[PDB]
Write an enzyme that holds these catalytic residues in place. Structure first.
Site: not given
Length: 135
Positions: A15, A29, A34, A37, A81
């Site tokens: 992401d 971002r 979501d 990660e 971001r």
């Protein structure tokens, strides 16, 4: 909203992508999603993290063109971001991740919620198809 051009610098995770935007390097971002990660000592590499990261990476590195689309609200988060929908050859990367079950629709913050229903539709389909995160 409108699309604007950008140039890939580096895909960082599922992401996060680093882009050259208006001649400046910036970390973006992806809005409203979501992804599992690869980076976070908390859990390290979550399941489907490498997959989501490779998916985003391939999609932007192989694009003829990359466009960024800011929403109606805040254009940066508290880490500096950019907050945007990213398009690779006309296809929204945020939606493609959700459509493939490699991302969930994030908690939404109005007014940055313009493509929320569209994403949630794609999420329902991926769940219906039991893809990846939903398998």
């Amino acid at each position: 909203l409108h699309k604007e051009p950008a140039t890939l610098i580096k895909a960082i995770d599922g992401d996060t992508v680093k882009l050259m935007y208006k001649g400046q390097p910036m970390t973006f971002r992806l809005l409203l999603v979501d992804i599992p990660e690869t980076k976070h000592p908390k859990k390290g590499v979550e399941k489907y993290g490498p997959e989501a990261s490779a998916f985003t990476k391939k999609m932007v590195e192989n694009a003829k063109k990359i466009e960024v689309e800011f929403d109606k609200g805040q254009r940066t988060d508290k880490y500096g971001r950019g907050l945007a929908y990213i398009y690779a050859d006309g296809k929204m990367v945020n939606e493609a991740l959700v459509r493939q079950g490699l991302a969930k629709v994030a908690y939404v913050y109005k007014p940055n919620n313009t493509h929320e229903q569209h994403l949630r539709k794609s999420e329902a389909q991926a769940k219906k198809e039991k893809l990846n995160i939903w398998s």
